[PDB]
Design an enzyme around this catalytic site. Sequence first.
Site, PDB file in Angstrom:
ATOM      1  N   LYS A 234       0.831  -1.194   0.000  1.00 17.82           N
ATOM      2  CA  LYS A 234       0.000   0.000   0.000  1.00 17.82           C
ATOM      3  C   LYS A 234       0.871   1.251   0.000  1.00 17.82           C
ATOM      4  O   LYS A 234       2.089   1.173   0.165  1.00 17.82           O
ATOM      5  CB  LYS A 234      -0.937  -0.052   1.209  1.00 17.82           C
TER       6      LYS A 234
ATOM      7  N   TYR B 256     -12.322  -2.343  -3.920  1.00 18.32           N
ATOM      8  CA  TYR B 256     -12.874  -2.487  -2.581  1.00 18.32           C
ATOM      9  C   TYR B 256     -14.385  -2.286  -2.547  1.00 18.32           C
ATOM     10  O   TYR B 256     -14.935  -1.901  -1.508  1.00 18.32           O
ATOM     11  CB  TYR B 256     -12.195  -1.509  -1.630  1.00 18.32           C
TER      12      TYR B 256
ATOM     13  N   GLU C  27      -9.135 -10.860  -8.118  1.00 22.28           N
ATOM     14  CA  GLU C  27      -8.246  -9.725  -7.895  1.00 22.28           C
ATOM     15  C   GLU C  27      -7.068  -9.745  -8.857  1.00 22.28           C
ATOM     16  O   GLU C  27      -6.645  -8.691  -9.353  1.00 22.28           O
ATOM     17  CB  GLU C  27      -7.766  -9.719  -6.441  1.00 22.28           C
TER      18      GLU C  27
END
Lengths: 140, 140
Positions: A10, A50, A127
């Site tokens: 991230k 998300y 994903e």
Amino acid sequence: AIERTISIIKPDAVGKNVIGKIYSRFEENGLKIVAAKMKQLTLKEAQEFYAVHKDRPFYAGLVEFMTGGPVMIQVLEGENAVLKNRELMGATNPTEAAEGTIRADFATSVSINAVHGSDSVENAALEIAYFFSQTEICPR
Amino acid sequence: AIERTISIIKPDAVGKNVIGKIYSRFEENGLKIVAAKMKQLTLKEAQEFYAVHKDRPFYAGLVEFMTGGPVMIQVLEGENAVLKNRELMGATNPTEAAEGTIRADFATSVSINAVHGSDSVENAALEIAYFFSQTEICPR
């Protein structure tokens, strides 16, 4: 059985310049990097990735976090890769993450938590396909 | 001056699963990864990227080695990035490479030498442009 799962480093952990330390956490625990790219996520990409959380209070902040700087995205391959990735990541709360996990070492808070990993075999396929074409995966 | 240089982790180091340890050499010395992709080089790609050595005896072997398996390619950013990358890589022959350099720890021979990096600012621009569009670079 050998699986493939997505990992995202991230913007906090990229900004800390600990991509290599995190990569070594995978490589020294029987996972191989078979696809990888650095990317600046758009708002739409963060929101869609998300989308499962779209009705939760933390959603707006999570999208802002995940678009606030570049991320490092890779496909990890190995035995039990989905659950082994999540074990190496650790619990989201850095206070509770087990010693030696990625979040124990590099997470700032339960929200600013350094890494994402797919949470199931089905979710890993979705994903991976979200960020990669099959032709971007490089067998050894 | 805040430069950008290209780095390639060659198929020998990728196959050893030391991408992370090599990334940490860059990051723990101030360099930042601002673009990155894992890629399987084609014969033409390895030939064109190393066309400066086409008339040298090691050209054919260098092309085979760089296409035998996937590589990890990244743009490194930081002051004196071009020279600093070369300092971290070390001498081409691992016997002459300084202690703690990449080749001292991860190179097999003078030919199986784990890493490539641009040799000049002008060649760094060309090499970056060969593998990346400017839209693939992710400033911090």
